[PDB]
């Protein structure tokens, strides 16, 4: 440590940007989901 | 008559704002005050040391002394028909920089540089502020659409 | 209409309160000079001829030598609207051309023995009607005893003004208010 304390930074590597997390849903997706959830409830209660 | 107590009538002026109690944010202690700059005095009840008197809350003065935790300020106070420059020591928590001075210092900078640009370009530029002039003459297009006719509405007695 | 009159009349001397006919003749002379000449020197001299004795303090010989030794002041006439007094703490007097209303006998002897010249204000008008090549001097106006008593009151914290005291000693206004051991000391 006393002879060579200088730090050599790990070289940065360019990589392909791959998403490992879910992106946020948009307003259109959120509104559509309620539309089809409502329709399924009406359809299921009508069938039974 | 009423009392001469130091904190009489400070029930609201020294209270913390709603949902803003607790630990004092640390950037207030990191603000740097030099000799000659203008500060707003606003007492905070969370810190009871170095507290300005209520008559200096909402007042603005300039720094004449800097100590370890406090600042000396020259503040104008009106006393029965005469204005005197009081010197008060206030801890750092109860003061903040005054943005009016910062705006003026910026305007001095853009003025000086506009003088240099004007001299180098051989032109003349306006540097004095002017009050809002009367509105200039202009045309208003109807776009082939008649103005909507407004009319007072009849009176109705609601609940 | 809708004005105030309490400051309409300016309070200043338009003539000497004195009845000294010789001063009245110099006022007649310098009234003409202030009017018919564009010199502001003649205007300043005219004002000082009107002024009272407390406003015309004596000018010490030492102070005039001090002010006439400053650079560029050589071969100029020192003008005093007042009395030139002798200073015994000065041992060497150079040659000076001094114009004054009054010069004390010992001052006049020392100035003349040094080779200098003393002029009156009528000879100053004949030599320099404009006031060219002059140094207009004045004695210390606040250098008298009444000003030690003026100002912030003695019994007020940061005041260094002299009280009106009949006699000076340990028993005369030194105990309470001038001492932390007797009441207070501000």
């Amino acid at each position: 440590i006393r002879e060579n304390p200088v730090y050599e930074k790990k070289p940065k590597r360019e990589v392909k940007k791959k998403r490992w997390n879910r992106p946020k849903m948009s307003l259109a997706q959120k509104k559509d989901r309620v539309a089809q959830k409502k329709a399924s409830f009406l359809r299921a209660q009508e069938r039974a | 008559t009423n009392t001469k107590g130091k904190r009489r009538g400070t029930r609201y002026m020294f209270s913390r704002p709603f949902r803003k109690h607790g630990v004092v944010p640390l950037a207030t202690y990191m603000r740097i005050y030099k000799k000659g700059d203008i500060v707003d005095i606003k007492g905070m009840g969370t810190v009871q040391k170095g507290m300005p008197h209520k008559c200096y809350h909402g007042k603005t003065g300039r720094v004449y002394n800097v100590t370890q935790h406090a600042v000396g300020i020259i503040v104008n106070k009106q006393v029965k028909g005469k204005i005197l420059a009081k010197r008060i020591n206030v801890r750092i928590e109860h003061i903040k920089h005054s943005k009016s001075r910062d705006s003026f210092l910026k305007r001095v900078k853009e003025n000086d540089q506009k003088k240099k640009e004007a001299k180098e370009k051989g032109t003349w530029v306006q540097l004095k502020r002017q009050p809002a002039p009367p509105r200039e003459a202009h045309f208003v297009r109807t776009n082939g659409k008649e103005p909507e006719l407004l009319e007072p509405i009849p009176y109705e007695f609601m609940a | 209409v809708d004005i105030r009159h309490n400051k309409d009349r300016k309070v200043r001397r338009k003539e000497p309160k004195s009845q000294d006919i010789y001063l009245r003749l110099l006022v007649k002379l310098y009234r003409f000079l202030a009017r018919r000449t564009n010199s502001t020197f003649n205007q300043v001299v005219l004002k000082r001829l009107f002024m009272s004795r407390t406003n015309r303090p004596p000018l010490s010989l030492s102070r005039m030598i001090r002010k006439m030794k400053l650079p560029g002041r050589e071969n100029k006439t020192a003008v005093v609207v007042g009395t030139v007094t002798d200073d015994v703490r000065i041992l060497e007097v150079p040659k000076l051309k001094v114009c004054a209303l009054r010069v004390s006998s010992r001052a006049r002897s020392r100035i003349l023995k040094a080779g200098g010249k003393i002029l009156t204000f009528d000879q100053l008008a004949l030599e320099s009607p404009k006031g060219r090549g002059t140094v207009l001097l004045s004695g210390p106006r606040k250098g008298r005893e009444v000003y030690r008593h003026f100002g912030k009151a003695p019994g007020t914290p940061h005041s260094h003004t002299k009280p009106y005291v009949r006699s000076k000693g340990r028993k005369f206004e030194r105990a309470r208010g001038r001492r932390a051991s007797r009441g207070y000391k501000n």
Binding site: - | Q130, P131, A132, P133, P134, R135, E136, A137, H138, F139, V140 | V1, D2, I3
Partner: protein, 166 residues
């Protein structure tokens, strides 16, 4: 939509008895220290808000070319060495205002009317006009113009009032 006017003529229509301290201050800044005194005011947001303070005390509007002509010619005086001097010759104007380019009564009228550079100097040179009482009377000095009174901004009707007071 025409450009909103740049020039106003303001006439004090009230006396000096029982005036509030703020209205008193604004009136002496407008140089209306006497009843039926008049002056030209350059219109901008600074001056307009001043005129709103003294609204019950003044009757103002937009003068025309004839109004500025009759006021300056008939009872226009200069402030020459702190004195009220009648404008009888063009030399009086040239000695005080000639450095700005105003050398005659026509230059001073153009300067006031087509308000521009050096309006401050030309207008301050003019002593506040001492108008007479309005011949034919007034409607109501204590009420605003839009309520059948006298005060406030009569925008173009000020020229009718000037014909009767000048």
């Amino acid at each position: 939509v025409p450009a909103e006017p740049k020039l106003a003529f303001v006439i004090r229509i009230r006396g000096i008895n029982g005036v509030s301290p703020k209205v008193r201050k604004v009136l002496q800044l407008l140089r209306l220290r006497q009843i039926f005194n008049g002056t030209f005011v350059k219109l901008n947001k600074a001056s307009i808000n001043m005129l709103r303070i003294v609204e019950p005390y003044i009757a103002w509007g937009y003068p025309n070319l004839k109004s500025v002509n009759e006021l300056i010619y008939k009872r226009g005086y200069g402030k020459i060495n702190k004195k009220r001097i009648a404008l009888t010759d063009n030399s009086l104007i040239a000695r005080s205002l000639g450095k700005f380019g105003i050398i005659c009564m026509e230059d001073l009228i153009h300067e006031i009317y087509t308000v521009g550079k050096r309006f401050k100097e030309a207008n301050n040179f003019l002593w506040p006009f001492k108008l007479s009482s309005p011949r034919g009377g007034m409607k109501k000095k204590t009420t605003h113009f839009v309520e059948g009174g006298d005060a406030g901004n009569r925008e173009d009707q000020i020229n009718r009032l000037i014909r009767r007071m000048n």
